Write a protein that binds this DNA or RNA. Structure first.
Ligand SMILES: Nc1ccn([C@H]2C[C@H](O)[C@@H](COP(=O)(O)OP(=O)(O)OP(=O)(O)O)O2)c(=O)n1
Ligand SMILES: [Ca+2]
Ligand SMILES: [Ca+2]
Length: 411
DNA sequence: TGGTGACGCT
DNA sequence: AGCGTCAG
């Protein structure tokens, strides 16, 4: 009944902002946001601290409008390195966090600021030793128990007490051990980086990711098999990982529902007929809290790319500047690629050029030398047929986006 | 009116 | 190989 594994999702709280605040102490505990390119409307916001989220500041929001919402909003700038954003600060901080996380159990790099962790073996290893010694509530100073109890911190402690009181090879005891380990993990992350995070502990990846978002920030939530019916009864379908797009929308359309629990009243063959073999099976299992997607041992990315958008009147309409932006992208890609070669002992072998006209086109070619000029020229070569232009020195129709991606990595 | 990444389907 | 989807 999907209680074999113990899986945690650790995601950092307002991560880019925590990075900038670790760099600039004037920004700590203040309503502030991280911005991209001041010129257009003060810059698009990409990261909002919680003190600023209280005012209503959101991602994908021009900084100038956010200042209308919150006048006291402080802004920290993303580094700009070749006429384009440079995110190496946050990638290095991410690696900082991922290594600490790797010190406890096998992790799956899920994004720049979160990882899944498979804690089965560590829970067993701690359960064999420590003997029958109980679980002090002092071992979980930030854990919530979803559905308990049946002063926000008073609520928290009452639920934790109800859980610990009502407690061999029991899945709930496993979850408790893993939650203690995650408390440890997170205290280590905070002591060694200054960064704060939330976490979800459960039996699979999706339940862990939902639990991590139940109690943000700087808190962790345990979700047991038993909390699942109650939790899913009012859980909007779109909050589940991969049900936030078109598939999750049509599930609601066809089945005429609203929450996860209502998927239980359907047979597995029904949902397979509705959404496919692999999707019907997965939904039938998911609505009952069961998922088998494993925690893959992969801390390192599989692709390395740079894109630049050229919206509106700024799209590229000369070959003289398509050349130049391809060269800029190849430059940053090459710096990152040499760092990857010397840090991770592996080489990219295939280059992917992606372009858009007013990712409408993607081609691939050979990646043989970590050379910016070679790669820019080969990417150009690979895209020329697209230039409908009859005039030799213009480019029509203009390009809205350029994308360069090194992939197919060999040791 | 941004800049990335994993994965599925054919 | 190229496109479509999903999300941090
Ligand atoms: N559309 C997005 C989503 C994320 N990010 C970057 C900046 C974020 O700091 C980081 C991770 O984003 P999350 O969605 O995980 O959320 P935050 O880390 O900002 O905070 P929280 O998880 O507390 O909401 O990735 C981004 O630039 N654009
Ligand atoms: Ca986060
Ligand atoms: Ca996240």
């Amino acid at each position: 009944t999907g209680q074999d594994r113990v899986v945690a999702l650790v995601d950092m709280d307002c991560f880019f902002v925590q990075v900038e605040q670790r760099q600039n102490p004037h920004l700590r505990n203040k309503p502030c946001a991280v911005v991209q390119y001041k010129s257009w409307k003060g810059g698009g916001i990409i990261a909002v601290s919680y003190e600023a989220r209280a005012f209503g500041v959101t991602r994908s929001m021009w900084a100038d409008d956010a200042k209308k919402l919150c006048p006291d909003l402080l802004l920290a700038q993303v580094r700009e390195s070749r006429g384009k954003a440079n995110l190496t600060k946050y990638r290095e901080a991410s690696v900082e966090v991922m290594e600490i996380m790797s010190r406890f159990a096998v992790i799956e790099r899920a994004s720049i600021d979160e990882a899944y962790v498979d804690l089965t073996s560590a829970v067993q290893e701690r359960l064999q030793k420590l003997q029958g010694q109980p679980i002090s509530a002092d071992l979980l100073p930030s854990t919530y128990i979803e559905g308990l109890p049946q002063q926000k911190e008073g609520m928290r402690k009452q639920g934790l007490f109800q859980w610990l009181d009502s407690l061999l090879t029991s899945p709930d005891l496993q979850l408790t051990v893993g939650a203690v380990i995650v408390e440890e993990m997170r205290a280590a992350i905070e002591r060694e980086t200054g960064f704060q995070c939330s976490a979800g502990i459960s039996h699979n990846k999706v339940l862990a990711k939902l639990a991590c978002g139940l109690n943000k920030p700087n808190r962790q939530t345990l979700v047991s098999h038993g909390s699942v019916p109650q939790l899913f009864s009012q859980m909007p379908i779109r909050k589940i990982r991969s049900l936030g797009g078109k598939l999750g929308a049509s599930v609601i359309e066809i089945l005429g529902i609203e929450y996860m629990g209502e998927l239980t009243q359907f047979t597995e063959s029904q949902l397979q007929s509705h959404f496919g073999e692999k999707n019907g099976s997965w939904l039938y299992a998911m609505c009952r809290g069961i998922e088998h997607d494993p925690v893959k041992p992969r801390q390192l990315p599989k692709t390395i790319g740079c894109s630049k958008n050229f919206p509106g009147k700024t799209a590229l309409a000369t070959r003289e500047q398509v050349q130049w932006w391809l060269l800029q992208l190849a430059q940053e890609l090459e710096e990152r690629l040499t760092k990857d070669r010397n840090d991770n002992d592996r080489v990219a072998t295939q280059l992917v050029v992606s372009i858009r006209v007013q990712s409408s086109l993607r081609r691939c070619c050979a990646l043989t030398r970590y050379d910016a000029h070679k790669m820019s020229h080969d990417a150009f070569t690979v895209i020329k047929n697209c230039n409908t232009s009859g005039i030799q020195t213009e480019w029509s129709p203009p390009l809205t986006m350029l994308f360069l991606c090194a992939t197919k990595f060999s040791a």
